[PDB]
Ligand binder design. Structure first.
Ligand SMILES: Cc1nc(-c2ccc(CO)cc2)no1
Length: 209
């Protein structure tokens, strides 16, 4: 059972802007996704201080970066708080509407796409480099879900039958054909060092072959 949803017009407009605007500094997508992972890890860590059983689904708090040249995917995995179905379908979009409006206003005033994270909609910078994004997520209070969108105004949500994750979120970037540099170890290392040097969780860059 796959459910198909329409983005709100404002988020669809944001996604088109990210896909269509000429902007060479695409590497900032990784900083934004790592920042989102760090925030999700902060949240489960804080909740565990008053309810340690929230870590029964996994004590380790970390971020993994997994390139796969055969699939042409870059996956950003965290063991953070995860997202519920309501987050995926309703709550994220509610927060994203006001963040998008503020970001658009800033852009017309002279800001650039790299400041997207200051408006809470940094996730959508994934579409600087990805033609499709798949998000697999598991929150302690809900089932494991797969969200997916190739933009074009719609996204899907289904219950995920793949490998159970325990708790957290995997963002799978199906890279555009001309963006395969973000599968190269030295390039990912360079970007993490430049933009994500002080993240308070271990970031493991997996190696291929
Ligand atoms: C869809 C969608 N997924 C996310 C998202 C994914 C991953 C994280 C970090 O775990 C945070 C937010 N935002 O919109």
């Amino acid at each position: 059972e796959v459910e198909t949803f329409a983005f709100q017009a404002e988020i669809a407009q944001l996604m088109s802007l990210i896909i269509n605007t000429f902007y060479s500094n695409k590497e900032i997508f990784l900083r934004e996704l790592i920042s989102n992972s760090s925030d999700a890890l902060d949240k489960i860590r804080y909740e565990s201080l008053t309810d340690p059983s929230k870590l029964d689904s996994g004590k380790e708090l970390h971020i993994n970066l997994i390139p796969n040249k055969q699939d042409r995917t870059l996956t950003i995995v965290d063991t953070g708080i995860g997202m519920t179905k309501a987050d995926l379908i309703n709550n994220l979009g509610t927060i994203a509407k006001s963040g998008t409006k503020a970001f658009m206003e800033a852009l017309q005033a002279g800001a650039d796409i790299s400041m997207i994270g200051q408006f809470g909609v940094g996730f959508y910078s994934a579409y600087l480099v990805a033609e499709k994004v798949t998000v697999i997520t598991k929150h302690n209070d809900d089932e494991q879900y797969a969200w997916e969108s190739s933009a074009g105004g719609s996204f899907t949500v289904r219950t995920d039958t793949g490998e159970p994750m325990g708790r957290g979120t995997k963002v799978i970037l199906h890279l555009k054909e001309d963006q395969t540099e973000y599968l190269e170890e030295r390039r990912i290392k360079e970007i993490v060092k430049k933009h994500s040097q002080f993240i308070g969780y271990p970031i493991t860059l997996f190696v291929e072959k």
